[PDB]
Design a protein around this ligand. Structure first.
Ligand SMILES: [Ca+2]
Ligand SMILES: [Ca+2]
Ligand SMILES: [Ca+2]
Ligand SMILES: [Ca+2]
Ligand SMILES: [Ca+2]
Ligand SMILES: [Ca+2]
Ligand SMILES: [Ca+2]
Ligand SMILES: [Ca+2]
Ligand SMILES: [Ca+2]
Ligand SMILES: [Ca+2]
Ligand SMILES: [Ca+2]
Ligand SMILES: [Ca+2]
Lengths: 203, 203, 203, 203, 203, 203
């Protein structure tokens, strides 16, 4: 069996990438759900709960500012698929941020696209460690594309055999992430139009 | 003596399945109780407390979203029946999730049906390891049926003698689990109607 | 000297039974005290601290649900009388649960009645191992009665000489335990009336 | 040189008694200090650290309940004076409990009075082994009095020559211990008045 | 890769300096965002959340008093770039305060200028520890200037080789910080004019 | 470096004194600022926030009654200079109360005068613990005078070498505190005249 889906579109699920030990890449899928608070909490458990809190708090800033969803009155549940000892995750992981946006908006995410990077509270995608090793894991999982922070482009060093097996997509900002992974449609168009101001503000 | 019941309907009790060591299956009954918080806590102890937290947090998302029970203001007590060294449980175990739903709703669970799988925060049943070995344990305990994640169907490899001794029921979603194990009646009908939106959302 | 009392009524003290090594029964008295938390902690130490946590967490569920004592804001101190290497205790020991109820309610427990069994979070008394050997220890200590889980009744096999020396009382539920060991009186009546709903719910 | 003081009053120091090997008594002085936690810890090391934890946890129950000191937010340091291989200490040693009370209250303890016994979480003094041999050690150290659990009174068997050399004081409860060893004064009066409810509750 | 930018102007981002362990300096970039509250919260997580609360509360005082922004009805998100164990940050870090002002005003901060210091609620820059070591980190990161509290000027002791590699700028007050790091322009002029009263009040 | 100023007059800043651990004195400067509320809040964070709330609420009573400042429509920011683990502050610390009065009135406080004491809602200065140890800290910091509650005068016990290094000023009431620390001038005269009724009422 496998804990990631390699093709198709799913709401609230993103193929993130992380490292186990010092150097081994893994596909680390994230599933998010948002609910009414019945003040909202970030609900997460385990070794990566701090990363979940970082990502959810940072994405909440951009959601409030640019989309106007009252995420402060929602509970946000973050699930990491596959428990591993010694996982090193991306600070403020963009995969978690993306899963939250997908969940709140009801817009499915392309499972063939893995991603790694850290979300700034301003909507920028900041560099992370282990990019080559994460890309390798994505290739071994049969994923088609991998989003990485633009500032990590020169960190990519793959074998000739692995090069060519995956499309590497460098990004500066969260809206480029959403452009590449969200399912095309009315909902996406509408959301992307709200995020345009983030791009205008950031350039 | 035995720590599982093999027939009849009980509130808040589910015959889960787990692995001890690398490969030996065990029946791992879960008993859950929900109480007023007198913010609610997940109350669990021992080697499997993290799995209990995962399952309770994930099921809380679907309970809040689809049933509107204020589970955030309840304490949720999870008990694993039978302490074993070296138990490997299902992440976000569906048996724990089911026991919690049964406890909150007061709808008994069929003890003749064992289950294994991991609950997503979206209500999906995700694949787990050791499915053949868990099925074997269910057969040795005299259980009639075993629910497994659909994605584990091709992981089943039983002897001719064991094949035929238990009905294997693959599932995609939590509501199918509840369909098969919850006692038929007004209460079930009412609950299943609330969970219908989960199925609509997930398909 | 002796570490158990064989007759009379004492608040917060119960003659539990356990096993040392594989098969030797022992009387294992438990003394409990509850205090204000000055969030409450289970305060216990030694080899059996996990069993103390299990029993206290499980009894807390029934105390909150049925009696409304704010046990969550109390510290609960569990003492095992007599340190032994290689003690195997009852999971969620009913003797610990009973001692806690006695301590919180100020209702003394009959020292002539030993007990063994595991408390479910629903208030059921679940079967345990070594029942014959525990009964033997109770007989050797000069105790008059021994409460055991009903599901262990067929596990009793005593010599003709030992048979007849102790009254074996099988139980299904915690309120039967309390019926047999708590001192008769206004306080007991009042508490038993609160626990009646547990019995109604469990039957 | 000697590791015990035989006369005078000292804060936080008690002449406990223990056994080395199977039968040889020793004077085992305890020194305790309480500090702010800067959740409080029991700080102890060596072969007897478990006994220190037992005694400190049990006395904490009575301190919280009857005196209202927030011992949960203090660190409690326990020192055993004289390291010996093969020391068998009293479970929940009353000497450790007494040293802690003396330290928290700033009321000195009479060094001419040795003691042995186990503290229950309810404030009772429970019987221990080796009482004759501990009394002998107290006599050889030149101590004037020895407190023992009342239930050990019939365990005393001294030579004619040793009989008569020490006053044996049997006790039921911790407040009798404190009555005999704490320095007379305003502080003692005040503390003894708080512990009166323990005696009322225990009789 | 690197987690700091060494040149250019960015809104809401400041190259702060901190210490890891006892003595090692690090560049600790801060990114801040302010949003509508949808009462405002300081939203921060991790080991340095208390410092973030201090800095945001202190800067809020000067923002309310001198600029009249209703920061009380904004959420203020603070992100520390790069998670490290054992970071010791500046109390009420001026880098956090500056990032908040930059974010609320939309005026970019010069990334070539690092800073360390503690903001008083009156707008003063108070001394901090580890100034030499922080300056060293700034030099190793390739930063051009470092702002330090004036009272730390005599704490600077750099090698001949490091001296000369960075401009050290001592400051008394927050407006001098803003003078040196904020991008020149209409927006800055306007803001600096509001802060002039702080300087008048503080001198 | 140092976190206190030892000479000169500063608005809103007071050299308070506190204890760390059980007995070590520290100089704990307080800085206060008052702003418009844009209902007013006490804005404080950290381990001492409750003391800040106490002091600000108590001083607000006397400010409203005797000076007529509408402090209810101001935010009051309290900053403790120097974070320490295990600080024990003065309940309703007079240093915090004084800093607030200084901030609201714009009258500087003499930094050479340290103080300790608790402010009553009636304007009295109530006794505190650790006075000798706080005085010692003031002496070690090079402060010239220390205000203490009159009822603590007999608690002072300094070495011959320390005696003589600081002027100890006992006080009954807040206006004596203000007499000794506020800068002489029109503003002070005016404020002291308003507080005269407090003294008349309290004598
Ligand atoms: Ca390509
Ligand atoms: Ca590409
Ligand atoms: Ca079949
Ligand atoms: Ca089937
Ligand atoms: Ca009989
Ligand atoms: Ca019977
Ligand atoms: Ca005598
Ligand atoms: Ca005697
Ligand atoms: Ca220069
Ligand atoms: Ca310079
Ligand atoms: Ca003088
Ligand atoms: Ca004087």
């Amino acid at each position: 069996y496998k804990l990631f889906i390699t093709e198709g579109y799913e709401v609230g699920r993103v193929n993130g990438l992380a490292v186990i030990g010092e150097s081994a890449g893994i596909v680390l899928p994230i599933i998010a759900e948002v609910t009414p608070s019945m003040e909202g909490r970030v609900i997460a458990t385990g070794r990566l709960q701090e990363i979940a809190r970082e990502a959810v708090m940072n994405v909440s800033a951009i959601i409030k500012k640019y989309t106007g969803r009252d995420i402060s009155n929602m509970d946000v549940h973050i699930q990491f698929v596959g428990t591993y000892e010694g996982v090193a995750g991306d600070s403020a992981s963009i995969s978690i941020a993306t899963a939250v946006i997908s969940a709140i908006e009801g817009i499915p995410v392309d499972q063939s696209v893995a991603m790694t990077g850290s979300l700034s509270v301003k909507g920028e995608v900041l560099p992370v460690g282990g990019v080559t090793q994460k890309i390798e894991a994505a290739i071994q999982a049969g994923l088609k594309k991998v989003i990485i922070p633009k500032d990590n482009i020169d960190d990519v060093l793959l074998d000739a055999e692995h090069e060519g097996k995956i499309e590497v997509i460098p990004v500066s900002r969260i809206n480029e992430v959403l452009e590449h992974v969200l399912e095309d449609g009315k909902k996406k168009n509408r959301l992307m139009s709200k995020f345009k101001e983030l791009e205008l503000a950031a350039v």
